Amino acid sequence: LELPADTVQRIAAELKCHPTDERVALHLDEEDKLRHFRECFYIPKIQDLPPVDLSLVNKDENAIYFLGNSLGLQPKMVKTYLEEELDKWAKIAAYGHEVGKRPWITGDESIVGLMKDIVGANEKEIALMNALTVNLHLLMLSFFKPTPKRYKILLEAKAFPSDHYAIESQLQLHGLNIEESMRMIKPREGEETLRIEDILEVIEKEGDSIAVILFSGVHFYTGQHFNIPAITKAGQAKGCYVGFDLAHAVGNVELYLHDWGVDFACWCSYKYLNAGAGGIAGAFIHEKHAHTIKPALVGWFGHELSTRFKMDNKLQLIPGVCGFRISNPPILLVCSLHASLEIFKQATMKALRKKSVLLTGYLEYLIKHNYGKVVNIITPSHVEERGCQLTITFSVPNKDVFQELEKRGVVCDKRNPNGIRVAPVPLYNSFHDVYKFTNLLTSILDS
Amino acid sequence: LELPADTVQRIAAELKCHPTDERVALHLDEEDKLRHFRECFYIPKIQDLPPVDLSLVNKDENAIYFLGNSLGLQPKMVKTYLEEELDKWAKIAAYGHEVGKRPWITGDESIVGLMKDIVGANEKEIALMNALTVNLHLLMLSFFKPTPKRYKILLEAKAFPSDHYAIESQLQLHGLNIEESMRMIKPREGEETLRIEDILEVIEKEGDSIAVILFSGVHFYTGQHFNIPAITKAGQAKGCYVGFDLAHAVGNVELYLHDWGVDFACWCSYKYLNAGAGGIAGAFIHEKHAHTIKPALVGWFGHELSTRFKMDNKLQLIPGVCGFRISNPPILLVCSLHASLEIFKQATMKALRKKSVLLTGYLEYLIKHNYGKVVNIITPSHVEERGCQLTITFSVPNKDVFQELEKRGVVCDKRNPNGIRVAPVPLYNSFHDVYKFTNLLTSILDS
Ligand SMILES: *Cc1c(COP(=O)(O)O)cnc(C)c1O
Ligand SMILES: *Cc1c(COP(=O)(O)O)cnc(C)c1O
């Protein structure tokens, strides 16, 4: 299949322009079958952004929002969905637990079907509950059962701090020596990303002593998308459980958790899934574990619905991940996530990933064409080894590139000493966004 | 001080009517300094309630909503508060984490001050996070540390199912025999409530072997309000930790968790606190434990704010209950709770408890006057031994009282075989509500 760089160059030829011409981005936007989804979101205006220098920008232009990997833009329908539940609460109060589009007792289950295609799992394998790191702990309390022979947790070095702290506290819970039991894979000297052959070597050599492998799906800092099925197979080959924090993977890369045989996973909803800060999180457990991996911590919402409200204190635990659901679900959080997932349903992950590959590929192409020496893309170059996000470093001692970018209405993340992350997302970022960004960047780098 | 029954009879004398006259309820409503708060809430109309028989009711009359102990009515300002955060998310997206009335990073801390007077604790002793039973588990993982000598958990028999399941799973986590380690105080033969002298006897006799006492503040089924400071002192006398599930206490009875020296507590926000189904829950840990009782499960939101976002993976744990906060807080849930707590701030728990004593006392008076033989109030009669809620049973073999009540727009809870709970709450229930309810009840009982 045609690589992004080649698509860009072929399109330019057809248009009779240079691949770096604005006309290429405009054409790609015209051909984008997902173009209409941008209208489904509230996009900030440049003049409203706190760090913006108004002298440097055109008023009433949209922001170039490349932070959708961290805090996803708002589906316009969030308010409408909230209003449905507020109106029910106003009109019938307590009766809302049992009636309506989203009966509160089953608020989570009413929309979980919309997650099936996003993570590649069945309805009984997915729970919508709590918060990401909270879910990580709930799962680890059942999946991490260390023995004298098999007691290690394997993860990447420089994991996201929350996961790092979670893993540390899990080890401390069992009185395990951290330095000996917390195995962290570091890159080779002079490299920032991990080589798959190196990960697999560690697993092959140390796997017998490892209880659980807990990796990110996409590493937050490098933008590296790890080979989930390869790590899963390798870990299970050595008798390890393999789970993933998919915070930067869900709604970004395509996922087949069930078919890949992943043991468990967890994710948040306020990044690529656009549900709003601190939104209701998610958990997956493969159905193969439904009768054998039981919740460590139980609440009444792990009791089967049909008899839960008998309140006879005779537990009837739901098999699989829903047995891990402790409390009644927050309807208001269900509302905002639901609005987002209806959009994902219409777009499809297949079509979104297709646009992403071309969009991020176009960004990479323009960067490398303009500065192919000063500018380094740390994110892996193989299209299958990254998602939306590129992590980029700069060697310009006199310029804080990030500061100059944010002053001009580019919303992205800082990488110290002198770099960005940027993640154009297919739902609401355009090829023209990418074109405009690269122009601002070039203008900054030229001084 | 004057008992409710005596207030009712004195008022009637002044009015020159019988204490059972409608004019007494109308007068009490006129004198109610909290009368205006009823306008702050969306009260269902009778015709909108699913089980209502329209032939039996007057259209456009308000429901008699006595289920505010289970799902509290909606503050009208919830929508407005949500809109503030949705507007910020629309306007500045990611920048909302750090700016505004409720910067998302500190969404919980921005409103925690409003809880101080409600639970009687300092800002560093209160966390707003997660869900009730979830918080119970987080606290028990740190407070329940069984030894061969001291391994029991003490609770009431027929505790709320979620707490029952939580306590059971906590015991199983340590491989403890449930029947031997789960000590449940049952009432004497022919009684439904517990005697304080009996609770204290169990504590005195068995206290040395008990690691944690975990009681409800108000028992959901009987409506009994336990003497929290007495149980706390008695338990600590024997070296036990004493914690409470305050789900039916917070926003109902007055609380002084800090001054009483309670070790820990947890509560929900969708009952008397009116925050909406599955709302953000609460946790208390006495400051005396801040440096000695550490979280079992850690996430990045337990790391001090000033260095959290350095993301260097070097934990700097916040002392006390905020060290137990694992994840970033849900802004949308913060919003709805905030709207409610502003109302509580204006009303004050002191004034609300005062109205409650008179209101529930008036309900009890009318019931007992009309049927002082057929009708039994299980809830303790001492004003200090109950909150808003009365639990009532009926001996009428041919009438399902609950069914007849709900058909007429009375919203309450069922008690099998033939009984209610009812909880008139001072924020939005009136003395006239109580009058109307008793009339419907009398009419039902007469047949
Ligand atoms: C309502 C109630 C619960 C409900 O638990 P959630 O965790 O909020 O679902 C738990 N415990 C008690 C004592 C209650 O009254
Ligand atoms: C953003 C992120 C988190 C944040 O954790 P919460 O529990 O949602 O506060 C955790 N882990 C990873 C890998 C992330 O990218």
mmCIF file of N, CA, C and O in Angstrom, chain A residues 99-162:
data_model
loop_
_atom_site.group_PDB
_atom_site.id
_atom_site.type_symbol
_atom_site.label_atom_id
_atom_site.label_comp_id
_atom_site.label_asym_id
_atom_site.label_seq_id
_atom_site.Cartn_x
_atom_site.Cartn_y
_atom_site.Cartn_z
ATOM 1 N N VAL A 99 -35.841 3.879 34.548
ATOM 2 C CA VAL A 99 -36.440 4.182 33.243
ATOM 3 C C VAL A 99 -35.622 5.140 32.371
ATOM 4 O O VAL A 99 -34.732 5.833 32.857
ATOM 5 N N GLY A 100 -35.917 5.146 31.076
ATOM 6 C CA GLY A 100 -35.313 6.108 30.157
ATOM 7 C C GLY A 100 -34.300 5.516 29.199
ATOM 8 O O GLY A 100 -34.071 4.301 29.180
ATOM 9 N N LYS A 101 -33.714 6.390 28.384
ATOM 10 C CA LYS A 101 -32.638 6.028 27.464
ATOM 11 C C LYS A 101 -31.436 5.455 28.223
ATOM 12 O O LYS A 101 -30.806 4.499 27.775
ATOM 13 N N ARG A 102 -31.134 6.051 29.371
ATOM 14 C CA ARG A 102 -30.028 5.611 30.217
ATOM 15 C C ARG A 102 -30.545 5.436 31.645
ATOM 16 O O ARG A 102 -30.366 6.328 32.477
ATOM 17 N N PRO A 103 -31.176 4.282 31.941
ATOM 18 C CA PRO A 103 -31.597 4.050 33.321
ATOM 19 C C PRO A 103 -30.332 4.108 34.181
ATOM 20 O O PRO A 103 -29.352 3.444 33.854
ATOM 21 N N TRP A 104 -30.334 4.927 35.233
ATOM 22 C CA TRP A 104 -29.094 5.170 35.962
ATOM 23 C C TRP A 104 -28.438 3.894 36.480
ATOM 24 O O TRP A 104 -27.217 3.772 36.423
ATOM 25 N N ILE A 105 -29.236 2.941 36.960
ATOM 26 C CA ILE A 105 -28.658 1.678 37.450
ATOM 27 C C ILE A 105 -27.767 1.019 36.393
ATOM 28 O O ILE A 105 -26.724 0.460 36.725
ATOM 29 N N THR A 106 -28.167 1.116 35.125
ATOM 30 C CA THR A 106 -27.411 0.509 34.024
ATOM 31 C C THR A 106 -26.852 1.554 33.055
ATOM 32 O O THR A 106 -26.645 1.266 31.873
ATOM 33 N N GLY A 107 -26.592 2.757 33.566
ATOM 34 C CA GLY A 107 -26.053 3.847 32.752
ATOM 35 C C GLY A 107 -24.838 3.426 31.947
ATOM 36 O O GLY A 107 -24.756 3.689 30.744
ATOM 37 N N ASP A 108 -23.895 2.756 32.609
ATOM 38 C CA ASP A 108 -22.680 2.277 31.959
ATOM 39 C C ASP A 108 -22.963 1.219 30.883
ATOM 40 O O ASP A 108 -22.434 1.279 29.763
ATOM 41 N N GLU A 109 -23.814 0.258 31.219
ATOM 42 C CA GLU A 109 -24.111 -0.846 30.313
ATOM 43 C C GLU A 109 -24.896 -0.367 29.096
ATOM 44 O O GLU A 109 -24.843 -0.995 28.036
ATOM 45 N N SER A 110 -25.598 0.756 29.246
ATOM 46 C CA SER A 110 -26.424 1.285 28.159
ATOM 47 C C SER A 110 -25.584 1.796 26.985
ATOM 48 O O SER A 110 -26.079 1.880 25.865
ATOM 49 N N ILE A 111 -24.305 2.090 27.228
ATOM 50 C CA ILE A 111 -23.439 2.647 26.183
ATOM 51 C C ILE A 111 -22.185 1.817 25.921
ATOM 52 O O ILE A 111 -21.407 2.130 25.023
ATOM 53 N N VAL A 112 -21.983 0.766 26.710
ATOM 54 C CA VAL A 112 -20.770 -0.044 26.594
ATOM 55 C C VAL A 112 -20.647 -0.698 25.193
ATOM 56 O O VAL A 112 -19.538 -0.929 24.696
ATOM 57 N N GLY A 113 -21.786 -0.955 24.554
ATOM 58 C CA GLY A 113 -21.803 -1.526 23.200
ATOM 59 C C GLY A 113 -21.002 -0.687 22.215
ATOM 60 O O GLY A 113 -20.379 -1.223 21.298
ATOM 61 N N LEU A 114 -21.010 0.633 22.427
ATOM 62 C CA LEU A 114 -20.294 1.581 21.578
ATOM 63 C C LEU A 114 -18.772 1.496 21.709
ATOM 64 O O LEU A 114 -18.040 2.070 20.901
ATOM 65 N N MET A 115 -18.303 0.766 22.713
ATOM 66 C CA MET A 115 -16.875 0.568 22.923
ATOM 67 C C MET A 115 -16.328 -0.680 22.229
ATOM 68 O O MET A 115 -15.118 -0.816 22.079
ATOM 69 N N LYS A 116 -17.220 -1.576 21.808
ATOM 70 C CA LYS A 116 -16.833 -2.883 21.276
ATOM 71 C C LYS A 116 -15.831 -2.788 20.129
ATOM 72 O O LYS A 116 -14.793 -3.456 20.145
ATOM 73 N N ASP A 117 -16.154 -1.962 19.140
ATOM 74 C CA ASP A 117 -15.302 -1.784 17.968
ATOM 75 C C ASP A 117 -14.060 -0.946 18.266
ATOM 76 O O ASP A 117 -13.059 -1.035 17.551
ATOM 77 N N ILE A 118 -14.122 -0.138 19.318
ATOM 78 C CA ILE A 118 -13.006 0.738 19.648
ATOM 79 C C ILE A 118 -11.849 -0.050 20.264
ATOM 80 O O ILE A 118 -10.684 0.180 19.919
ATOM 81 N N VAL A 119 -12.165 -0.988 21.158
ATOM 82 C CA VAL A 119 -11.122 -1.798 21.796
ATOM 83 C C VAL A 119 -11.045 -3.241 21.254
ATOM 84 O O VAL A 119 -10.107 -3.970 21.573
ATOM 85 N N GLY A 120 -12.015 -3.638 20.433
ATOM 86 C CA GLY A 120 -12.029 -4.989 19.878
ATOM 87 C C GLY A 120 -12.335 -6.032 20.943
ATOM 88 O O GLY A 120 -11.607 -7.012 21.091
ATOM 89 N N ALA A 121 -13.415 -5.823 21.692
ATOM 90 C CA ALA A 121 -13.806 -6.765 22.751
ATOM 91 C C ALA A 121 -15.315 -6.876 22.816
ATOM 92 O O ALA A 121 -16.021 -6.030 22.280
ATOM 93 N N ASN A 122 -15.802 -7.927 23.473
ATOM 94 C CA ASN A 122 -17.237 -8.149 23.651
ATOM 95 C C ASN A 122 -17.799 -7.337 24.817
ATOM 96 O O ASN A 122 -17.037 -6.831 25.650
ATOM 97 N N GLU A 123 -19.125 -7.204 24.874
ATOM 98 C CA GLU A 123 -19.776 -6.376 25.898
ATOM 99 C C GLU A 123 -19.496 -6.832 27.328
ATOM 100 O O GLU A 123 -19.395 -5.998 28.225
ATOM 101 N N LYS A 124 -19.344 -8.142 27.524
ATOM 102 C CA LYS A 124 -19.033 -8.707 28.841
ATOM 103 C C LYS A 124 -17.549 -8.609 29.220
ATOM 104 O O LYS A 124 -17.168 -8.964 30.340
ATOM 105 N N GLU A 125 -16.724 -8.120 28.295
ATOM 106 C CA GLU A 125 -15.286 -7.962 28.530
ATOM 107 C C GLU A 125 -14.899 -6.531 28.873
ATOM 108 O O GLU A 125 -13.742 -6.259 29.214
ATOM 109 N N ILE A 126 -15.864 -5.622 28.762
ATOM 110 C CA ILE A 126 -15.627 -4.197 28.949
ATOM 111 C C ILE A 126 -16.444 -3.653 30.132
ATOM 112 O O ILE A 126 -17.628 -3.949 30.262
ATOM 113 N N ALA A 127 -15.792 -2.873 30.993
ATOM 114 C CA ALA A 127 -16.484 -2.121 32.035
ATOM 115 C C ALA A 127 -16.145 -0.635 31.916
ATOM 116 O O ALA A 127 -14.998 -0.261 31.654
ATOM 117 N N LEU A 128 -17.159 0.203 32.087
ATOM 118 C CA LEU A 128 -16.965 1.641 32.113
ATOM 119 C C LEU A 128 -17.194 2.094 33.548
ATOM 120 O O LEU A 128 -18.313 2.043 34.038
ATOM 121 N N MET A 129 -16.121 2.510 34.216
ATOM 122 C CA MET A 129 -16.157 2.762 35.661
ATOM 123 C C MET A 129 -14.947 3.539 36.150
ATOM 124 O O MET A 129 -13.874 3.487 35.533
ATOM 125 N N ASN A 130 -15.069 4.104 37.010
ATOM 126 C CA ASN A 130 -14.107 4.715 37.920
ATOM 127 C C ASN A 130 -13.218 5.736 37.216
ATOM 128 O O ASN A 130 -13.674 6.568 36.433
ATOM 129 N N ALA A 131 -11.855 5.662 37.475
ATOM 130 C CA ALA A 131 -10.821 6.432 36.797
ATOM 131 C C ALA A 131 -9.701 5.474 36.391
ATOM 132 O O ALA A 131 -9.624 4.344 36.888
ATOM 133 N N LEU A 132 -8.866 5.902 35.449
ATOM 134 C CA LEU A 132 -7.874 5.003 34.845
ATOM 135 C C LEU A 132 -6.983 4.307 35.888
ATOM 136 O O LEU A 132 -6.930 3.068 35.950
ATOM 137 N N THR A 133 -6.278 5.090 36.701
ATOM 138 C CA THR A 133 -5.298 4.498 37.623
ATOM 139 C C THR A 133 -5.993 3.675 38.705
ATOM 140 O O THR A 133 -5.464 2.651 39.157
ATOM 141 N N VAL A 134 -7.185 4.122 39.092
ATOM 142 C CA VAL A 134 -8.044 3.358 39.995
ATOM 143 C C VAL A 134 -8.314 1.971 39.412
ATOM 144 O O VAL A 134 -8.106 0.963 40.093
ATOM 145 N N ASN A 135 -8.762 1.917 38.155
ATOM 146 C CA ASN A 135 -8.993 0.634 37.484
ATOM 147 C C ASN A 135 -7.737 -0.226 37.379
ATOM 148 O O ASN A 135 -7.798 -1.452 37.557
ATOM 149 N N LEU A 136 -6.612 0.409 37.066
ATOM 150 C CA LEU A 136 -5.330 -0.294 37.039
ATOM 151 C C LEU A 136 -5.107 -1.060 38.355
ATOM 152 O O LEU A 136 -4.776 -2.256 38.341
ATOM 153 N N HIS A 137 -5.303 -0.366 39.481
ATOM 154 C CA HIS A 137 -5.169 -0.987 40.804
ATOM 155 C C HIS A 137 -6.152 -2.140 41.023
ATOM 156 O O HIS A 137 -5.760 -3.194 41.516
ATOM 157 N N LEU A 138 -7.420 -1.942 40.654
ATOM 158 C CA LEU A 138 -8.434 -2.987 40.826
ATOM 159 C C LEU A 138 -8.050 -4.277 40.096
ATOM 160 O O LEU A 138 -8.220 -5.370 40.631
ATOM 161 N N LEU A 139 -7.522 -4.124 38.886
ATOM 162 C CA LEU A 139 -7.094 -5.240 38.041
ATOM 163 C C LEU A 139 -5.828 -5.910 38.573
ATOM 164 O O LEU A 139 -5.751 -7.142 38.649
ATOM 165 N N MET A 140 -4.842 -5.097 38.946
ATOM 166 C CA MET A 140 -3.576 -5.604 39.507
ATOM 167 C C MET A 140 -3.754 -6.364 40.825
ATOM 168 O O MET A 140 -2.995 -7.277 41.118
ATOM 169 N N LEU A 141 -4.753 -5.990 41.622
ATOM 170 C CA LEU A 141 -5.024 -6.695 42.880
ATOM 171 C C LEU A 141 -5.474 -8.144 42.648
ATOM 172 O O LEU A 141 -5.305 -9.008 43.511
ATOM 173 N N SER A 142 -6.038 -8.395 41.473
ATOM 174 C CA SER A 142 -6.451 -9.734 41.076
ATOM 175 C C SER A 142 -5.410 -10.435 40.205
ATOM 176 O O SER A 142 -5.161 -11.629 40.383
ATOM 177 N N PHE A 143 -4.779 -9.694 39.296
ATOM 178 C CA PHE A 143 -3.803 -10.292 38.380
ATOM 179 C C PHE A 143 -2.378 -10.436 38.915
ATOM 180 O O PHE A 143 -1.646 -11.324 38.465
ATOM 181 N N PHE A 144 -1.980 -9.575 39.852
ATOM 182 C CA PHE A 144 -0.635 -9.660 40.434
ATOM 183 C C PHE A 144 -0.668 -10.461 41.735
ATOM 184 O O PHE A 144 -1.133 -9.978 42.771
ATOM 185 N N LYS A 145 -0.198 -11.705 41.641
ATOM 186 C CA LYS A 145 -0.173 -12.655 42.748
ATOM 187 C C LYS A 145 1.242 -13.226 42.802
ATOM 188 O O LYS A 145 1.487 -14.325 42.290
ATOM 189 N N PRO A 146 2.188 -12.464 43.390
ATOM 190 C CA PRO A 146 3.600 -12.853 43.352
ATOM 191 C C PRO A 146 3.904 -14.094 44.192
ATOM 192 O O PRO A 146 3.266 -14.321 45.220
ATOM 193 N N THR A 147 4.879 -14.878 43.739
ATOM 194 C CA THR A 147 5.385 -16.026 44.488
ATOM 195 C C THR A 147 6.902 -15.859 44.612
ATOM 196 O O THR A 147 7.477 -14.999 43.942
ATOM 197 N N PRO A 148 7.558 -16.646 45.485
ATOM 198 C CA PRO A 148 9.023 -16.596 45.505
ATOM 199 C C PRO A 148 9.710 -16.755 44.131
ATOM 200 O O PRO A 148 10.737 -16.120 43.896
ATOM 201 N N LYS A 149 9.149 -17.571 43.239
ATOM 202 C CA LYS A 149 9.737 -17.790 41.909
ATOM 203 C C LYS A 149 9.333 -16.738 40.875
ATOM 204 O O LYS A 149 10.106 -16.422 39.971
ATOM 205 N N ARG A 150 8.116 -16.218 41.001
ATOM 206 C CA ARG A 150 7.541 -15.354 39.977
ATOM 207 C C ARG A 150 6.864 -14.159 40.652
ATOM 208 O O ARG A 150 5.736 -14.264 41.134
ATOM 209 N N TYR A 151 7.560 -13.024 40.674
ATOM 210 C CA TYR A 151 7.179 -11.889 41.524
ATOM 211 C C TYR A 151 7.396 -10.517 40.871
ATOM 212 O O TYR A 151 6.963 -9.495 41.409
ATOM 213 N N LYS A 152 8.060 -10.492 39.718
ATOM 214 C CA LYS A 152 8.377 -9.227 39.057
ATOM 215 C C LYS A 152 7.215 -8.635 38.258
ATOM 216 O O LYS A 152 6.340 -9.348 37.746
ATOM 217 N N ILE A 153 7.216 -7.311 38.165
ATOM 218 C CA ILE A 153 6.357 -6.611 37.231
ATOM 219 C C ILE A 153 7.269 -5.973 36.181
ATOM 220 O O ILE A 153 8.248 -5.296 36.527
ATOM 221 N N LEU A 154 6.960 -6.214 34.905
ATOM 222 C CA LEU A 154 7.739 -5.659 33.804
ATOM 223 C C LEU A 154 7.022 -4.489 33.144
ATOM 224 O O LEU A 154 5.858 -4.597 32.773
ATOM 225 N N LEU A 155 7.749 -3.385 32.976
ATOM 226 C CA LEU A 155 7.212 -2.182 32.337
ATOM 227 C C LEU A 155 8.326 -1.448 31.612
ATOM 228 O O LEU A 155 9.504 -1.810 31.726
ATOM 229 N N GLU A 156 7.961 -0.416 30.862
ATOM 230 C CA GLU A 156 8.969 0.434 30.247
ATOM 231 C C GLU A 156 9.536 1.404 31.293
ATOM 232 O O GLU A 156 8.835 1.792 32.237
ATOM 233 N N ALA A 157 10.813 1.757 31.150
ATOM 234 C CA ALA A 157 11.395 2.853 31.928
ATOM 235 C C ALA A 157 10.730 4.151 31.480
ATOM 236 O O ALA A 157 10.264 4.254 30.337
ATOM 237 N N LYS A 158 10.686 5.129 32.379
ATOM 238 C CA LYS A 158 10.003 6.395 32.111
ATOM 239 C C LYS A 158 8.546 6.163 31.674
ATOM 240 O O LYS A 158 8.044 6.801 30.747
ATOM 241 N N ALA A 159 7.878 5.240 32.360
ATOM 242 C CA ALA A 159 6.435 5.068 32.228
ATOM 243 C C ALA A 159 5.753 6.330 32.749
ATOM 244 O O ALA A 159 6.371 7.119 33.472
ATOM 245 N N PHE A 160 4.493 6.527 32.370
ATOM 246 C CA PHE A 160 3.695 7.613 32.927
ATOM 247 C C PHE A 160 3.706 7.530 34.461
ATOM 248 O O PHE A 160 3.574 6.435 35.011
ATOM 249 N N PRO A 161 3.922 8.673 35.146
ATOM 250 C CA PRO A 161 4.103 8.664 36.607
ATOM 251 C C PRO A 161 3.026 7.920 37.389
ATOM 252 O O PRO A 161 3.351 7.236 38.361
ATOM 253 N N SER A 162 1.765 8.029 36.969
ATOM 254 C CA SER A 162 0.688 7.387 37.709
ATOM 255 C C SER A 162 0.864 5.868 37.725
ATOM 256 O O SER A 162 0.720 5.233 38.782
#
